[PDB]
Amino acid sequence: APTAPSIDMYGSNNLQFSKIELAMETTSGYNDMVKYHELAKIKVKFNQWSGTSGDTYNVYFDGVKVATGAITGSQTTASFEYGQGGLYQMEIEACDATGCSKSAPVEITIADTDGSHLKPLTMNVDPNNKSYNTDPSIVMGTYFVEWGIYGRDYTVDNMPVDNLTHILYGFIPICGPNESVKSVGGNSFNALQTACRGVNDYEVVIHDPWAAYQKSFPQAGHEYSTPIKGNYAMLMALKQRNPDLKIIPSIGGWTLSDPFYDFVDKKNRDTFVASVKKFLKTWKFYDGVDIDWMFPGGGGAAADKGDPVNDGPAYIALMRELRVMLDELEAETGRTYELTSAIGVGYDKIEDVDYADAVQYMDYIFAMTYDFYGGWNNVPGHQTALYCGSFMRPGQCDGGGVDENGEPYKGPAYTADNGIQLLLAQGVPANKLVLGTAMYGRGWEGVTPDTLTDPNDPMTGTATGKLKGSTAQGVWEDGVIDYKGIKSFMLGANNTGINGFEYGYDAQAEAPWVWNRSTGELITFDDHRSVLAKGNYAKSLGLAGLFSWEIDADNGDILNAMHEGMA
């Protein structure tokens, strides 16, 4: 037998290889920054500085032969390709006529976007998040936002993953018309332009590559040489920790829906669908696709867009086409992929789509049963109520009555049940509907007692403007506040109200509020009681389960109540 091969670690790139190349120190176009390979190029060097080198080598991964070639001289380079990610015990064998000798086993790392090379993620979850034995068949979803790692300081390892079936990752942009992005500020439009350089219109990209895959997280063991970092590497590790968990990219959202309006042309859908397939092959930790178009027929961020004739049919066609594409992926991989959508529940949004048609291709509809009322005007109301509140006029709930000016209502009032019933009325099965819970409040100021028509219902008052405050109190935008902020600064330990605020609950609507009489500050949100009511409602109707926006804003109370309501 010849001399046993000795691995040259430096000449073998410390045995670290990757199926994906990701730019870490620059920012450029998506296709410039991200290069995915179906086969990793492996290059291992070994030495035989004494005795006979032999004639032939064999490379083994966990005892399975993966390469073979010739040995010449004391130095040998073994170049081959390998397509499965993970950690393998590598042995290199040298053979001649007299026999074979093997190197000592050493670990080789081949990175892939399924996280197979990564150890399961260690968590840092707020202990206020409780442990539950909820039926795994019940949907328990939430949104994790890409930008939450900044001011909100909320990272993947903070998620109460044991209390979730679905993580929706917001948001994936589509290259093309995106004027609505400018309303965000923070240089987000320019960031999108950069990402889209070298990318065709209607193809998906990553908006924030720093957050997505570049940022080094010490809790995930990231270092300079780590081939995948950021939120994505952490989500990959999360898949290893919780194998039954579904992680789904959310495409669009309020600010990134503009390109959807061009899906009336099938050519644009074709381009999009193909890009999504590429995206799911590149990022293997993702378990499907979620479409967040706000909204078919219009009424979204872009006032100049919306086609009530063609948008709904395009939406249905998109779902059909996405399902065909996902079926291709299922055939190629043996995996199961999910197709979902978050949708508006206002009567004027629901009416623009035949969801009975669309839903045949879909696993779930995430019914966005919030944002019913808010700081966009000075009219108080329950933003996420199950039913019509006491503040509503007779006939307002169903929409058959008349407003202040004598003008008839144009449709049923904005409530969760009104939305759900409209979807059911179309023929959508209840077991595909997921009910939305809010982990945030919307709010006003100047709703002082004198503005109220009913003195002990602040929802009958009138605002002077939006709720204002600091990010310390969870106010990231005027008129919007994190639930955990409401709890910390308005509710207090026993939900009795602090800092001039009082707690109230509309039993008719199933909706809480906090009201400061002196400042006129009023906040509408979901709390333990209303979320219990939502869970009991979801069970009674046989809905698929519950979902929420956004997990960073919860302190545990809301997700806790979601589980307790579905018990």
Ligand X SMILES: CC(=O)N[C@@H]1[C@@H](O)[C@H](O[C@@H]2O[C@H](CO)[C@@H](O[C@@H]3O[C@H](CO)[C@@H](O[C@@H]4O[C@H](CO)[C@@H](O)[C@H](O)[C@H]4NC(C)=O)[C@H](O)[C@H]3NC(C)=O)[C@H](O)[C@H]2NC(C)=O)[C@@H](CO)O[C@H]1O
Applying CB under 6 A, which residues contact ligand X?
Answer: 147, 184, 186, 188, 253-255, 344, 346, 349, 371-372, 374, 376, 414, 476-477, 480, 549
Q: What is the nearest approach in angstroms of ligand X to the Cβ of residue 564?
A: 25
Half-sphere exposure of 147 (CA within 13 A, CB side): 12
Q: What is the nearest approach in angstroms of ligand X to the Cβ of residue 39?
A: 36
Q: What is the nearest approach in angstroms of ligand X to the Cβ of residue 349?
A: 6
3-class DSSP assignment, residue 417: helix
Taking Cα atoms as reference points, which of 376, 414, 421, 371 lies closest to residue 396?
414
Taking Cα atoms as reference points, which of 119, 306, 142 lies closest to residue 226?
119
- Which is closer to ligand X, CB of 313 or CB of 344? 344
CA-CA distance, 8 to 49, in Å (whole number)? 12
Q: What is the nearest approach in angstroms of ligand X to the Cβ of residue 369?
A: 9
Q: What is the nearest approach in angstroms of ligand X to the Cβ of residue 144?
A: 12
- Which is closer to ligand X, CB of 40 or CB of 367? 367
For the record, the structure tokens of 153 come out as: 């300081």
Evaluated on CA atoms 350, 356, 358, 364, the torsion sign reads: positive
Q: What is the nearest approach in angstroms of ligand X to the Cβ of residue 351?
A: 12
Taking Cα atoms as reference points, which of 522, 527, 405 lies closest to residue 459?
522
30 and 206 in contact (C-beta within 8 Å)?
Answer: yes
Q: Which helix (H) or strand (E) holds 209?
A: helix 209-209
For the record, the structure tokens of 530 come out as: 């209303």
- Which is closer to ligand X, CB of 130 or CB of 468? 468
Residue 27 — φ and ψ, nearest 5°? -135, 125
3-class DSSP assignment, residue 68: strand
Distance from the first to the final alpha carbon of the chain:
67
Taking Cα atoms as reference points, which of 441, 284, 421, 293 lies closest to residue 358?
293
Strands 64-70 and 16-18: unpaired
Q: What is the nearest approach in angstroms of ligand X to the Cβ of residue 179?
A: 13
Residue with tokens 């906090």: 514
Residue whose CB is nearest to ligand X in the complex, by number: 254
CA-CA distance, 453 to 462, in Å (whole number)? 9
- Which is closer to ligand X, CB of 305 or CB of 349? 349
- Which is closer to ligand X, CB of 349 or CB of 487? 349
CA-CA distance, 431 to 412, in Å (whole number)? 23
Q: What is the nearest approach in angstroms of ligand X to the Cβ of residue 414?
A: 5
- Which is closer to ligand X, CB of 272 or CB of 476? 476
CA-CA distance, 355 to 297, in Å (whole number)? 14
Distances in Å between the Cα of 424 and the Cα atoms of 348, 420, 434 are 15, 6, 12
CA-CA distance, 343 to 364, in Å (whole number)? 11
Q: What is the nearest approach in angstroms of ligand X to the Cβ of residue 59?
A: 47
3 and 93 in contact (C-beta within 8 Å)?
Answer: no
- Which is closer to ligand X, CB of 94 or CB of 416? 416
- Which is closer to ligand X, CB of 414 or CB of 525? 414
- Which is closer to ligand X, CB of 374 or CB of 458? 374
Q: What is the nearest approach in angstroms of ligand X to the Cβ of residue 541?
A: 20
- Which is closer to ligand X, CB of 226 or CB of 415? 415
Q: What is the nearest approach in angstroms of ligand X to the Cβ of residue 377?
A: 8
What residue ranges in 37-132 does DSSP mark as E strands? 40-47, 56-61, 64-70, 75-82, 86-95, 100-102, 106-111
Q: What is the nearest approach in angstroms of ligand X to the Cβ of residue 426?
A: 17
3-class DSSP assignment, residue 292: strand
- Which is closer to ligand X, CB of 54 or CB of 374? 374
- Which is closer to ligand X, CB of 62 or CB of 398? 398
128 and 122 in contact (C-beta within 8 Å)?
Answer: no
